[model samples]
Each structure stands twice: as C-alpha cells, then as structure tokens.
Target: SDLIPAPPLSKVPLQQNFQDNQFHGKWYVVGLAGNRILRDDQHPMNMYATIYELKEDKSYNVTSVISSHKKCEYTIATFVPGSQPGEFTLGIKSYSYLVRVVSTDYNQYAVVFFKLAEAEFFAITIYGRTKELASELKENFIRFSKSLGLPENHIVFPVPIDQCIDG
Candidate 1:
C-alpha cells in the first residue's frame, strides 16, 4: 500500500445533457476510490468538500478543502468544458479529464469519474449536496463500482470535515 501504486484505467461513460447550471453549488465527498495519495503520508490532506461555480467564460471554478494531520488545506482549480457535455479538463497544476455520470437531479447524487494516471485504476467519486447519501444511492454506488471491475474493498467513504464547510 505504501511502496507501490496501482495502475490507472480508461475513462468512463459520461452523463448526457449534463446541465452546467444544475451542477453549480456546494457538494460533499461522500465516496471515493482508494488511491495511492491516501496512503502517502507525505500527502496527508484528502478532499472532503468541493464547491463549483460557473464562470463568465463558460468555464467552472472549483474549490476543494481537505483535512491534514496539522490543519485543513484548500485548493482551487479551473474546469474547462470540453467539446461534449459532461466532459471537462480540470486544471489543478497538471490536467485531469473529468466526466460526470449518474447525477440524479444534481441535488442528491452525482458520480464523477477520473483516471489515476497509472493506467490500471480509475477513481470514481460520489458526491452529494449533504454529507451523507441515501441508502439506495449508496448501494447503487457500490454496485456501480463493482461493475467497473474495482474491488469492493478498494472503495473508500471519506469522512466529512466541519470546520472547512462551516467556516
């Protein structure tokens, strides 16, 4: 878990018509896939809260707050829309392509897919407007990951932070 990292996988299918306006707002990281970053103690901070806002240029401004051993850390990113809907290139130092999938009304649940760079594993993050997801949606999330060939145990449910969101 510490010495080596897993391989990244190919991109997943994106949601159709994905309305950008509906996606704007605050979202909580209810679930994520296990990644090398989580165990790299050097990188202690793990994402907890995410905020998205549409910009005047049709891009999106993304903000994320994560908790570390000593304190919380905040990061800002720019998401430029792609030629197709629901596809974006998230710029945060480097670049990571993002695809939105299975957003039920954009208020309750949203599943985002990103590749992990190693070519054998991909990350699927489940987001919710609140801290927790509904029971049925949670189950569906697990099923969806399993269907993607990701091990059930590798799915991680991140703990939410209060100070970052409240403050």
Candidate 2:
C-alpha cells in the first residue's frame, strides 16, 4: 500500500471560461511543484519559457525553451484537446501527459497542472506574461500547490535566465 495517495483531479479547479485565443503567446515559467522528477536533487532547475500557438483544429503547437548549463534547449510538442475545456493531452512515444489549465487571467499569470498517465507523478507550473510576477501571485501558487498535498520542499522558484528571451 502507498503511504501518500495521489491527489484527486476532481479537487483541482479548471480555468473559468478558458480562451484559447488569449492563451496563445509566450509565457515564462515562474514556479513549479512536483512529486518526482522536479524533486530530484541531482538536477538543478533552470528558467524556461513556453510559447503556445493555437491551431484551427483546437490543438496547440507548444514550444518550450529551457536554459540549462548556460545553454538553451528547445523542445516542441502538440497539445490535443481533451473532452473538457482547459484540459489537454500531450503524448511522446509511450508516455502521455494530462495537462490542465488550473487558473489564469490571460493578461498576467496562469497556473497549470500536469500528470503522467502511466504513473502517479504530477506537476504544477505557474506561468507569467513577464519574467517576474507579483508576490501575491506567487503566494497563491504556493497555497494551491500545498492544498494539493505537495510538500514545501517539492515546490521551487527557478532562477531567471537571459538566454532565449528574444527570437
């Protein structure tokens, strides 16, 4: 038996009236909380940015730029819409991820959740229109993650990097 139960998705609230059009743009990842991969001590977390381009089919062309070891890396993926609004699925070979927009204002910040389909691993990310966000927004992210059973140590605020900011 498992000592810590997986957080229930039903308890997580989706973005109210999520609009794909407004969500399409560059967002800087300001906060992250997770159970496994993000909690690893060996790998240091760095700042990342994601650009979303909405497709006519409702899928999203997602591009992620991450700064690691003083270098920039880019990865591209597609997010297929799920049955419900603000919910999407991203698959890479045998692995699949359930992605949901937990909260967002479209102009300032957004909170998103991701879960691995084959395992209990899950992560929550906070995105801002700019590299920096208000302190209250960060507090809300902490409270939300904690409510989902994530320990304080599991949550992190990655240092910002200058690379890959402009074209």
Candidate 3:
C-alpha cells in the first residue's frame, strides 16, 4: 500500500511544464519499481507500455496488454488530466482507477487503483526521461519517497535506460 507522504508531495503543488500535454507525444514505460503484484515476465504479456494517443473528449485509448498465470486482460483506462505532468485520472471501469504518466515527460508517477471509491496505491514506479535520473532528481525522488515511507532501495532500477535501449 503506497501511503501518502507526511508533508505530502501533492502539497508540493504540481508544476505546469506542459499545459497542452493531452496526447501530444508518445511515452514508453521503460521500467517499474516499488510494489506491483505484477511484473514483466514475457512477451504478449506486457508489463510495460507506450502511449499511443488520447482523445480530445477526454477518453483515451492505449495498446498495452498484460497476461499472467494463465489469466489475461486487455486494458482501457478513460483518462482525465491530473495536476502533474502526463498525470491523468484513469478509470478502467470506474473511479476505482489507476493514475498514469503522472509526469508529462514520463519521468515519474504514481500507480493508484480504486476499490468501489476506496483507493489504494503504490508509488509503484519512478521513471525518468533518461534511465538514470540526474543526481538532483534521484535524490529528490529518494528523499521525497522516504518522507512517504518508501526507502532508498525502495526503487528497483532495471538495466539503465541506455542499456535498455541498446539491448
């Protein structure tokens, strides 16, 4: 369960770097960290994704799928822009939802899911424009997460971004 930070990053007030971020470009989910009941295991079973488009009417469409343990499900989250970059309120069936691309540049975000209006989340991931976030960024993420009870090694760094691309 991803708990909110004591001081609260939301209290940090989301910055508006891209006011017109609605489906402007594509984003790749390079990796994931923190707690996720799911993990990347095999192809046709996507634990990662890239944004394709968002419709102006506020509903969006994506092309990512996840399957596991002989159970499979396709995803479609109706989105509403949130206070942060790339951030959106994604409701797969209801407000019982997931927050996606919380940063416009695809750098960092939260993964929240709802259960009949009661929400539970995990910081689940902390992404970066590059695989290795800048020192300042990394430190901030680490520090900020700590304030929220997430520890230093709380993040699971996959291969570095360059390595992911090269491989």
Candidate 4:
C-alpha cells in the first residue's frame, strides 16, 4: 500500500477497441493521478516513458524509462493476455495487472491503470506521445482522477521532459 497509490476498489474504466498496433511505440508521462512515492515536493519531478513492442498473438514487451533530476533508469516488463482484451498481467514485478487505452488518439495520449491486485496498491500514469499536452487533457485527467476519489495532493503534475535515454 505504501509502495504505490491506492486506487478505488471499484471497477476501473477501460478503453474500447484497444489493438496491438495502436499501442506500439513510445508514450511520455504528462501527469500522474495517484503515486504514493511521488507526493513529496522536496524531490525532483519524476518523469517516465514507456515503449511497447507489439508481437504475435497479443504479446508485448514493455521498456520503461524513469528519470529524476540527475538519475535515470530503465526496466523491461512483459505482458501476457488476460481473460479479456486490453487487459494483461504484467511480468514487470510479480502479479501486477494493467488495463487502459488512449484517451484520444492512440498516438496522442493514453490513460493507464496498473494494479497490484493482491497487494491492494495501484498507480495511474498519464501518457502522451509527446512531452507536452493540452490543458484540457491535463484537466480531464485531474477531473477523472477526482471522480474516482483521489485526493488533490495525491494527484501530481510532473515536470515536462527535457532528457531521457532509451535502454
């Protein structure tokens, strides 16, 4: 619970028609709705980028980059199918699950929810094809997050991306 945001226990909203090709490529973090590790203001703004490599039969590999003021790191995660489409159990850590789709266009932005179900912890990472996003998009994410009962302090607007290295 302390490791990540605690999401509402209710069913999360899902994306429709989420295809493999639409998810391929890179996405940058614009804002985060609920991150327990990121609420402290003394810390440098955390930025993240995820690259999904789509493969046969709905399998994919995820390359994630996380950066702060002076340090950057990358982690690779894999996805296997769930009982439904656009749902998967990520092989990043242990039994984490992911469900989401692009908020608008696939190449523009996406709202993702990753949950460690048994642990009762979850996180939301707002993704954009670019580092910048429109104010409406940001606002929508905030409003949407609040609609799900996240507190204002739990919501975070991360710093704009300036540098990152693919690994």
Q: What lDDT score belongs to each candidate, Candidate 1 first? A: 0.69, 0.84, 0.42, 0.71
lDDT of 3 by residue, 66-124 (tens): 44455544455456665455455554333344354333343343222111224444554
124-159 per-residue lDDT for model 2 (tens digits): 999999889999999999999889888777888877
| TM-scores for every predicted model | 0.77, 0.88, 0.51, 0.81
Runs off by more than 4 Å, candidate 3:
1-12, 29-47, 63-76, 82-87, 92-95, 98-119, 129-132, 160-167
TM-score of 1: 0.77
Clashing pairs in 3: 85-103, 85-104, 86-101, 86-104, 107-127
Model 2: residue 96 alpha-carbon error in angstroms: 4.3
TM-score of 4: 0.81
Model 1 C-alpha lDDT per residue in residues 35-128, reported as the tens digit of each score: 4323233433344888889999878899887766667788998888875777776564542444445455698879887653434445778888
For 52-167, candidate 4 gives per-residue lDDT tens digits of 88878678788888875677877898887675666777654532465555244787888887667564656677888888788998888888777765766777767765667343
Clashing pairs in 1: 7-120, 7-121, 8-118, 8-119, 8-120, 8-121, 9-121
| Model 4 accuracy (lDDT, Cα) | 0.71
Query: What range of 10 consecutive residues in model 2 has the weakest lDDT sum?
Result: 36-45
Better of 1 and 2 by TM-score: 2
Residue 117, candidate 4: Cα error in Å is 2.0
